[PDB]
PDB file of all heavy atoms in Angstrom:
ATOM      1  N   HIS E  89    -209.857 -94.982-203.238  1.00 60.40           N
ATOM      2  CA  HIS E  89    -209.919 -95.035-204.653  1.00 60.40           C
ATOM      3  C   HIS E  89    -208.426 -95.254-205.149  1.00 60.40           C
ATOM      4  O   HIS E  89    -207.521 -94.697-204.639  1.00 60.40           O
ATOM      5  CB  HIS E  89    -210.387 -93.675-205.220  1.00 60.40           C
ATOM      6  CG  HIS E  89    -211.785 -93.433-204.948  1.00 60.40           C
ATOM      7  ND1 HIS E  89    -212.375 -92.123-204.864  1.00 60.40           N
ATOM      8  CD2 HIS E  89    -212.900 -94.296-204.799  1.00 60.40           C
ATOM      9  CE1 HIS E  89    -213.658 -92.207-204.635  1.00 60.40           C
ATOM     10  NE2 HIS E  89    -214.049 -93.433-204.597  1.00 60.40           N
ATOM     11  N   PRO E  90    -208.269 -96.101-206.193  1.00 63.16           N
ATOM     12  CA  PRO E  90    -206.940 -96.334-206.750  1.00 63.16           C
ATOM     13  C   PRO E  90    -206.357 -95.092-207.288  1.00 63.16           C
ATOM     14  O   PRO E  90    -207.007 -94.169-207.710  1.00 63.16           O
ATOM     15  CB  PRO E  90    -207.191 -97.389-207.799  1.00 63.16           C
ATOM     16  CG  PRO E  90    -208.396 -98.078-207.356  1.00 63.16           C
ATOM     17  CD  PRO E  90    -209.279 -97.061-206.697  1.00 63.16           C
ATOM     18  N   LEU E  91    -205.043 -95.031-207.181  1.00 64.63           N
ATOM     19  CA  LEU E  91    -204.313 -93.785-207.591  1.00 64.63           C
ATOM     20  C   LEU E  91    -204.326 -93.653-209.158  1.00 64.63           C
ATOM     21  O   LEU E  91    -204.386 -94.638-209.923  1.00 64.63           O
ATOM     22  CB  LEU E  91    -202.849 -93.872-207.202  1.00 64.63           C
ATOM     23  CG  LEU E  91    -202.493 -93.462-205.760  1.00 64.63           C
ATOM     24  CD1 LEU E  91    -202.859 -94.507-204.722  1.00 64.63           C
ATOM     25  CD2 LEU E  91    -200.992 -93.148-205.628  1.00 64.63           C
ATOM     26  N   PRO E  92    -204.325 -92.378-209.654  1.00 65.79           N
ATOM     27  CA  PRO E  92    -204.230 -92.231-211.058  1.00 65.79           C
ATOM     28  C   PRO E  92    -202.859 -92.732-211.588  1.00 65.79           C
ATOM     29  O   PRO E  92    -201.808 -92.628-210.878  1.00 65.79           O
ATOM     30  CB  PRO E  92    -204.268 -90.634-211.164  1.00 65.79           C
ATOM     31  CG  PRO E  92    -204.960 -90.271-210.028  1.00 65.79           C
ATOM     32  CD  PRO E  92    -204.597 -91.211-208.897  1.00 65.79           C
ATOM     33  N   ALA E  93    -202.927 -93.234-212.848  1.00 65.36           N
ATOM     34  CA  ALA E  93    -201.698 -93.718-213.450  1.00 65.36           C
ATOM     35  C   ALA E  93    -200.769 -92.579-213.903  1.00 65.36           C
ATOM     36  O   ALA E  93    -199.566 -92.753-214.223  1.00 65.36           O
ATOM     37  CB  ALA E  93    -201.931 -94.734-214.517  1.00 65.36           C
ATOM     38  N   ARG E  94    -201.240 -91.360-213.933  1.00 66.80           N
ATOM     39  CA  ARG E  94    -200.505 -90.202-214.260  1.00 66.80           C
ATOM     40  C   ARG E  94    -199.546 -89.780-213.051  1.00 66.80           C
ATOM     41  O   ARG E  94    -198.595 -89.043-213.256  1.00 66.80           O
ATOM     42  CB  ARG E  94    -201.347 -88.998-214.620  1.00 66.80           C
ATOM     43  CG  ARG E  94    -200.726 -87.956-215.493  1.00 66.80           C
ATOM     44  CD  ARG E  94    -201.441 -86.631-215.634  1.00 66.80           C
ATOM     45  NE  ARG E  94    -201.095 -85.864-216.770  1.00 66.80           N
ATOM     46  CZ  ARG E  94    -200.116 -85.088-216.805  1.00 66.80           C
ATOM     47  NH1 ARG E  94    -199.288 -84.910-215.760  1.00 66.80           N
ATOM     48  NH2 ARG E  94    -199.867 -84.407-217.970  1.00 66.80           N
ATOM     49  N   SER E  95    -199.876 -90.315-211.861  1.00 69.08           N
ATOM     50  CA  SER E  95    -199.126 -90.020-210.632  1.00 69.08           C
ATOM     51  C   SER E  95    -197.885 -90.873-210.524  1.00 69.08           C
ATOM     52  O   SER E  95    -197.434 -90.975-209.336  1.00 69.08           O
ATOM     53  CB  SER E  95    -200.119 -90.116-209.477  1.00 69.08           C
ATOM     54  OG  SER E  95    -200.396 -91.517-209.174  1.00 69.08           O
ATOM     55  N   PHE E  96    -197.496 -91.638-211.503  1.00 71.40           N
ATOM     56  CA  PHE E  96    -196.190 -92.288-211.390  1.00 71.40           C
ATOM     57  C   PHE E  96    -195.046 -91.335-211.381  1.00 71.40           C
ATOM     58  O   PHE E  96    -194.685 -90.700-212.355  1.00 71.40           O
ATOM     59  CB  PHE E  96    -195.946 -93.281-212.575  1.00 71.40           C
ATOM     60  CG  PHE E  96    -197.003 -94.490-212.542  1.00 71.40           C
ATOM     61  CD1 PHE E  96    -197.123 -95.287-213.700  1.00 71.40           C
ATOM     62  CD2 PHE E  96    -197.667 -94.751-211.472  1.00 71.40           C
ATOM     63  CE1 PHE E  96    -197.992 -96.302-213.663  1.00 71.40           C
ATOM     64  CE2 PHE E  96    -198.557 -95.845-211.408  1.00 71.40           C
ATOM     65  CZ  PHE E  96    -198.661 -96.632-212.521  1.00 71.40           C
ATOM     66  N   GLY E  97    -194.425 -91.243-210.167  1.00 72.80           N
ATOM     67  CA  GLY E  97    -193.440 -90.267-209.887  1.00 72.80           C
ATOM     68  C   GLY E  97    -193.926 -89.062-209.082  1.00 72.80           C
ATOM     69  O   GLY E  97    -193.248 -88.087-208.870  1.00 72.80           O
ATOM     70  N   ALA E  98    -195.174 -89.145-208.653  1.00 71.92           N
ATOM     71  CA  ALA E  98    -195.720 -88.090-207.812  1.00 71.92           C
ATOM     72  C   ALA E  98    -195.451 -88.249-206.338  1.00 71.92           C
ATOM     73  O   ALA E  98    -195.309 -89.452-205.833  1.00 71.92           O
ATOM     74  CB  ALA E  98    -197.267 -87.969-208.029  1.00 71.92           C
ATOM     75  N   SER E  99    -195.332 -87.240-205.605  1.00 75.08           N
ATOM     76  CA  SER E  99    -195.144 -87.116-204.190  1.00 75.08           C
ATOM     77  C   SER E  99    -196.338 -87.415-203.377  1.00 75.08           C
ATOM     78  O   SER E  99    -197.369 -86.961-203.755  1.00 75.08           O
ATOM     79  CB  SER E  99    -194.444 -85.827-203.706  1.00 75.08           C
ATOM     80  OG  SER E  99    -195.291 -84.728-204.114  1.00 75.08           O
ATOM     81  N   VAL E 100    -196.295 -88.129-202.290  1.00 77.71           N
ATOM     82  CA  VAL E 100    -197.295 -88.492-201.452  1.00 77.71           C
ATOM     83  C   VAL E 100    -196.910 -88.242-199.994  1.00 77.71           C
ATOM     84  O   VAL E 100    -195.758 -88.213-199.670  1.00 77.71           O
ATOM     85  CB  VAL E 100    -197.658 -90.073-201.664  1.00 77.71           C
ATOM     86  CG1 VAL E 100    -196.656 -90.944-201.078  1.00 77.71           C
ATOM     87  CG2 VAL E 100    -199.086 -90.294-201.218  1.00 77.71           C
TER      88      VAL E 100
END
Side-chain angles (χ1 to χ4, degrees):
Chain E
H89 293 151
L91 278 74
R94 207 194 200 277
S95 71
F96 289 167
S99 59
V100 74

